[PDB]
Amino acid sequence: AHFKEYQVIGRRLPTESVPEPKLFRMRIFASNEVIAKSRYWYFLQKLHKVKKASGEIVSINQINEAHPTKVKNFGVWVRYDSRSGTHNMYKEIRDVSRVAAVETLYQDMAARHRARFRSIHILKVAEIEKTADVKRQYVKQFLTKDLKFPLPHRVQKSTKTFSYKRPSTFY
RNA sequence: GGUUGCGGCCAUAUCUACCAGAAAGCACCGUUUCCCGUCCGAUCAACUGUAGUUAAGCUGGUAAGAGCCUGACCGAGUAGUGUAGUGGGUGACCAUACGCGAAACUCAGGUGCUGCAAUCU
């Protein structure tokens, strides 16, 4: 579904010798809470000696975008598995939210490298609104002062199967 | 607490090399008339409590000791693996989901514990 940024705070189960464990937290983009808690145990199993059975999740929360109607430059660092091996890349994309850029990121990763969600780890989603922090020319071109372009060859959708005049693609 | 006899678990007890051991206790031990097998009273058998021997046995301590034992979010949730998909990949194989989960390695700690009957300044 629509990716939602969840904060997931969990810990290892409290034993007698070690009450109050170290309370690790992650921000993971997921469709829903069930996948959020699942993705949490998957990564926390990767960085620590803990699995779902031996730990508990102490807080699950949604993080909302601070201002969902300002467009920003998002610096995305990702590792993914291709058929041959593993690679780390830094991509970047315009958006208004962290989540929709991550939705965009998974679409681009699937399209350009045939990477399924199973294969992708989102290392760090970073926002910058200051130029010269933007490295990719496919994003720099929308930051030129006084941007303006046409939308040539406008194709208009037809509700009916027949029309009674050749179409016009003017704009 | 030492020691002896009988033990239990059977190295946290073994192994190497040094250092120490008061009283209690093997025996430094001494002897061959007697029971007792032989080349050998060395082992084994029997007889004594002697110069007074702790030299050895034994016990303890030491050693960035070997070994052994215990533990660890140490490696490592790794390897492996139960279940699942009309997942990926030509394949070889791999990723993912729900579970189980090592061994090496590394780091620490530990040098037997203990039952019964006696005996001991």
Side-chain angles (χ1 to χ4, degrees), chain A residues 36-56:
Chain A
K37 285 197 260 42
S38 190
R39 285 315 277 165
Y40 176 80
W41 286 125
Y42 167 85
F43 287 123
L44 194 83
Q45 271 176 253
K46 285 184 131 34
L47 299 314
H48 287 290
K49 175 56 96 218
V50 53
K51 38 197 209 164
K52 156 155 187 207
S54 69
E56 75 157 347

mmCIF file of all heavy atoms in Angstrom, chain A residues 36-56:
data_model
loop_
_atom_site.group_PDB
_atom_site.id
_atom_site.type_symbol
_atom_site.label_atom_id
_atom_site.label_comp_id
_atom_site.label_asym_id
_atom_site.label_seq_id
_atom_site.Cartn_x
_atom_site.Cartn_y
_atom_site.Cartn_z
ATOM 1 N N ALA A 36 5.529 -3.316 9.426
ATOM 2 C CA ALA A 36 6.470 -2.471 10.153
ATOM 3 C C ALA A 36 7.185 -3.252 11.249
ATOM 4 O O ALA A 36 8.413 -3.208 11.361
ATOM 5 C CB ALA A 36 5.748 -1.260 10.732
ATOM 6 N N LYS A 37 6.429 -3.981 12.066
ATOM 7 C CA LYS A 37 7.037 -4.769 13.129
ATOM 8 C C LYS A 37 7.843 -5.925 12.559
ATOM 9 O O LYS A 37 8.830 -6.358 13.156
ATOM 10 C CB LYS A 37 5.955 -5.282 14.071
ATOM 11 C CG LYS A 37 5.382 -4.230 14.997
ATOM 12 C CD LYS A 37 4.643 -4.867 16.166
ATOM 13 C CE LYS A 37 3.135 -4.881 15.944
ATOM 14 N NZ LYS A 37 2.775 -5.257 14.553
ATOM 15 N N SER A 38 7.422 -6.456 11.411
ATOM 16 C CA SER A 38 8.174 -7.524 10.771
ATOM 17 C C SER A 38 9.506 -7.014 10.241
ATOM 18 O O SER A 38 10.553 -7.625 10.481
ATOM 19 C CB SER A 38 7.351 -8.143 9.647
ATOM 20 O OG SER A 38 7.970 -9.312 9.162
ATOM 21 N N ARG A 39 9.483 -5.893 9.514
ATOM 22 C CA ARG A 39 10.714 -5.321 8.987
ATOM 23 C C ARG A 39 11.660 -4.932 10.106
ATOM 24 O O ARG A 39 12.881 -4.946 9.927
ATOM 25 C CB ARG A 39 10.406 -4.104 8.115
ATOM 26 C CG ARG A 39 9.831 -4.423 6.755
ATOM 27 C CD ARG A 39 10.575 -5.552 6.100
ATOM 28 N NE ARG A 39 11.788 -5.097 5.443
ATOM 29 C CZ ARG A 39 12.760 -5.896 5.039
ATOM 30 N NH1 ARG A 39 12.714 -7.199 5.250
ATOM 31 N NH2 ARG A 39 13.799 -5.375 4.399
ATOM 32 N N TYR A 40 11.116 -4.573 11.268
ATOM 33 C CA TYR A 40 11.958 -4.224 12.406
ATOM 34 C C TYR A 40 12.759 -5.425 12.888
ATOM 35 O O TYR A 40 13.976 -5.340 13.062
ATOM 36 C CB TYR A 40 11.099 -3.659 13.534
ATOM 37 C CG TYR A 40 11.862 -3.353 14.792
ATOM 38 C CD1 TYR A 40 12.606 -2.191 14.909
ATOM 39 C CD2 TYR A 40 11.841 -4.227 15.868
ATOM 40 C CE1 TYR A 40 13.303 -1.909 16.057
ATOM 41 C CE2 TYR A 40 12.538 -3.952 17.015
ATOM 42 C CZ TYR A 40 13.265 -2.791 17.104
ATOM 43 O OH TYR A 40 13.962 -2.505 18.240
ATOM 44 N N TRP A 41 12.094 -6.560 13.100
ATOM 45 C CA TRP A 41 12.783 -7.754 13.577
ATOM 46 C C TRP A 41 13.768 -8.274 12.542
ATOM 47 O O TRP A 41 14.787 -8.867 12.897
ATOM 48 C CB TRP A 41 11.774 -8.849 13.936
ATOM 49 C CG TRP A 41 11.018 -8.625 15.207
ATOM 50 C CD1 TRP A 41 9.670 -8.614 15.356
ATOM 51 C CD2 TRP A 41 11.566 -8.394 16.505
ATOM 52 N NE1 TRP A 41 9.339 -8.382 16.660
ATOM 53 C CE2 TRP A 41 10.486 -8.240 17.389
ATOM 54 C CE3 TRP A 41 12.867 -8.296 17.006
ATOM 55 C CZ2 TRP A 41 10.663 -7.993 18.736
ATOM 56 C CZ3 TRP A 41 13.037 -8.053 18.342
ATOM 57 C CH2 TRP A 41 11.946 -7.905 19.194
ATOM 58 N N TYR A 42 13.475 -8.072 11.258
ATOM 59 C CA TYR A 42 14.397 -8.491 10.209
ATOM 60 C C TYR A 42 15.715 -7.735 10.300
ATOM 61 O O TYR A 42 16.792 -8.330 10.205
ATOM 62 C CB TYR A 42 13.765 -8.279 8.839
ATOM 63 C CG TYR A 42 14.743 -8.394 7.696
ATOM 64 C CD1 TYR A 42 15.048 -9.629 7.147
ATOM 65 C CD2 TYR A 42 15.361 -7.274 7.162
ATOM 66 C CE1 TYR A 42 15.923 -9.744 6.106
ATOM 67 C CE2 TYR A 42 16.243 -7.384 6.124
ATOM 68 C CZ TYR A 42 16.518 -8.620 5.599
ATOM 69 O OH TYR A 42 17.400 -8.743 4.566
ATOM 70 N N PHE A 43 15.645 -6.415 10.458
ATOM 71 C CA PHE A 43 16.869 -5.635 10.559
ATOM 72 C C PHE A 43 17.516 -5.804 11.924
ATOM 73 O O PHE A 43 18.720 -6.037 12.016
ATOM 74 C CB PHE A 43 16.579 -4.169 10.272
ATOM 75 C CG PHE A 43 16.308 -3.883 8.836
ATOM 76 C CD1 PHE A 43 15.125 -3.289 8.450
ATOM 77 C CD2 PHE A 43 17.223 -4.232 7.864
ATOM 78 C CE1 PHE A 43 14.868 -3.038 7.123
ATOM 79 C CE2 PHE A 43 16.973 -3.987 6.539
ATOM 80 C CZ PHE A 43 15.797 -3.386 6.166
ATOM 81 N N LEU A 44 16.733 -5.744 12.995
ATOM 82 C CA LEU A 44 17.322 -5.904 14.318
ATOM 83 C C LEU A 44 17.942 -7.282 14.486
ATOM 84 O O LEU A 44 18.856 -7.451 15.294
ATOM 85 C CB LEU A 44 16.275 -5.639 15.398
ATOM 86 C CG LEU A 44 16.796 -5.452 16.821
ATOM 87 C CD1 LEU A 44 17.247 -4.035 17.008
ATOM 88 C CD2 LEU A 44 15.723 -5.788 17.829
ATOM 89 N N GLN A 45 17.469 -8.277 13.734
ATOM 90 C CA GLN A 45 18.151 -9.562 13.707
ATOM 91 C C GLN A 45 19.472 -9.458 12.964
ATOM 92 O O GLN A 45 20.334 -10.328 13.098
ATOM 93 C CB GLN A 45 17.272 -10.626 13.054
ATOM 94 C CG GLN A 45 16.347 -11.365 14.002
ATOM 95 C CD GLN A 45 15.431 -12.337 13.293
ATOM 96 O OE1 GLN A 45 14.236 -12.092 13.159
ATOM 97 N NE2 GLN A 45 15.988 -13.450 12.834
ATOM 98 N N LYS A 46 19.646 -8.411 12.161
ATOM 99 C CA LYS A 46 20.854 -8.308 11.358
ATOM 100 C C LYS A 46 21.951 -7.562 12.104
ATOM 101 O O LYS A 46 23.139 -7.785 11.852
ATOM 102 C CB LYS A 46 20.541 -7.622 10.026
ATOM 103 C CG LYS A 46 19.806 -8.492 9.016
ATOM 104 C CD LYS A 46 19.633 -7.759 7.694
ATOM 105 C CE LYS A 46 20.059 -8.598 6.505
ATOM 106 N NZ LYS A 46 19.779 -10.040 6.696
ATOM 107 N N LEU A 47 21.580 -6.687 13.032
ATOM 108 C CA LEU A 47 22.544 -5.860 13.743
ATOM 109 C C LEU A 47 22.759 -6.264 15.198
ATOM 110 O O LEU A 47 23.597 -5.659 15.866
ATOM 111 C CB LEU A 47 22.135 -4.383 13.687
ATOM 112 C CG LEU A 47 22.010 -3.638 12.347
ATOM 113 C CD1 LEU A 47 23.207 -3.911 11.462
ATOM 114 C CD2 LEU A 47 20.719 -3.882 11.590
ATOM 115 N N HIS A 48 22.038 -7.255 15.712
ATOM 116 C CA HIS A 48 22.160 -7.612 17.116
ATOM 117 C C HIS A 48 21.751 -9.062 17.308
ATOM 118 O O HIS A 48 21.012 -9.634 16.504
ATOM 119 C CB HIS A 48 21.297 -6.722 18.017
ATOM 120 C CG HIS A 48 21.821 -5.331 18.174
ATOM 121 N ND1 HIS A 48 22.971 -5.045 18.874
ATOM 122 C CD2 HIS A 48 21.350 -4.146 17.723
ATOM 123 C CE1 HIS A 48 23.190 -3.744 18.842
ATOM 124 N NE2 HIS A 48 22.218 -3.175 18.152
ATOM 125 N N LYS A 49 22.223 -9.642 18.408
ATOM 126 C CA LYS A 49 21.871 -11.007 18.787
ATOM 127 C C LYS A 49 20.505 -10.971 19.469
ATOM 128 O O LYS A 49 20.369 -10.952 20.694
ATOM 129 C CB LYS A 49 22.944 -11.607 19.686
ATOM 130 C CG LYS A 49 22.613 -12.979 20.225
ATOM 131 C CD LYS A 49 22.323 -13.957 19.112
ATOM 132 C CE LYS A 49 23.546 -14.767 18.751
ATOM 133 N NZ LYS A 49 23.618 -14.995 17.295
ATOM 134 N N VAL A 50 19.467 -10.938 18.642
ATOM 135 C CA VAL A 50 18.095 -10.863 19.125
ATOM 136 C C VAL A 50 17.188 -11.242 17.968
ATOM 137 O O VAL A 50 17.455 -10.895 16.819
ATOM 138 C CB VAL A 50 17.776 -9.453 19.675
ATOM 139 C CG1 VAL A 50 18.105 -8.405 18.647
ATOM 140 C CG2 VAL A 50 16.336 -9.344 20.115
ATOM 141 N N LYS A 51 16.137 -11.990 18.271
ATOM 142 C CA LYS A 51 15.086 -12.283 17.315
ATOM 143 C C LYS A 51 13.750 -11.924 17.944
ATOM 144 O O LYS A 51 13.685 -11.391 19.050
ATOM 145 C CB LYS A 51 15.119 -13.748 16.868
ATOM 146 C CG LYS A 51 15.471 -14.759 17.940
ATOM 147 C CD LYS A 51 15.858 -16.063 17.297
ATOM 148 C CE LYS A 51 15.549 -17.231 18.197
ATOM 149 N NZ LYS A 51 15.578 -18.492 17.434
ATOM 150 N N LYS A 52 12.672 -12.207 17.217
ATOM 151 C CA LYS A 52 11.349 -11.788 17.663
ATOM 152 C C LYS A 52 10.956 -12.485 18.958
ATOM 153 O O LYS A 52 10.392 -11.860 19.862
ATOM 154 C CB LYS A 52 10.327 -12.065 16.562
ATOM 155 C CG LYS A 52 8.908 -12.224 17.040
ATOM 156 C CD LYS A 52 7.920 -11.888 15.950
ATOM 157 C CE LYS A 52 6.501 -11.894 16.480
ATOM 158 N NZ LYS A 52 5.517 -12.213 15.415
ATOM 159 N N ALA A 53 11.264 -13.778 19.069
ATOM 160 C CA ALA A 53 10.868 -14.546 20.243
ATOM 161 C C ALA A 53 11.534 -14.021 21.504
ATOM 162 O O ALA A 53 10.922 -14.007 22.576
ATOM 163 C CB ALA A 53 11.208 -16.020 20.039
ATOM 164 N N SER A 54 12.783 -13.590 21.400
ATOM 165 C CA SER A 54 13.564 -13.191 22.559
ATOM 166 C C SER A 54 13.466 -11.705 22.864
ATOM 167 O O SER A 54 14.160 -11.223 23.760
ATOM 168 C CB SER A 54 15.028 -13.587 22.362
ATOM 169 O OG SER A 54 15.634 -12.808 21.356
ATOM 170 N N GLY A 55 12.624 -10.969 22.150
ATOM 171 C CA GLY A 55 12.496 -9.544 22.355
ATOM 172 C C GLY A 55 11.048 -9.113 22.295
ATOM 173 O O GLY A 55 10.157 -9.907 22.006
ATOM 174 N N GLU A 56 10.833 -7.834 22.574
ATOM 175 C CA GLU A 56 9.511 -7.240 22.514
ATOM 176 C C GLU A 56 9.615 -5.868 21.872
ATOM 177 O O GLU A 56 10.656 -5.212 21.927
ATOM 178 C CB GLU A 56 8.872 -7.123 23.899
ATOM 179 C CG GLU A 56 9.449 -6.016 24.756
ATOM 180 C CD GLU A 56 8.497 -5.549 25.838
ATOM 181 O OE1 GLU A 56 7.301 -5.896 25.782
ATOM 182 O OE2 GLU A 56 8.953 -4.839 26.756
#
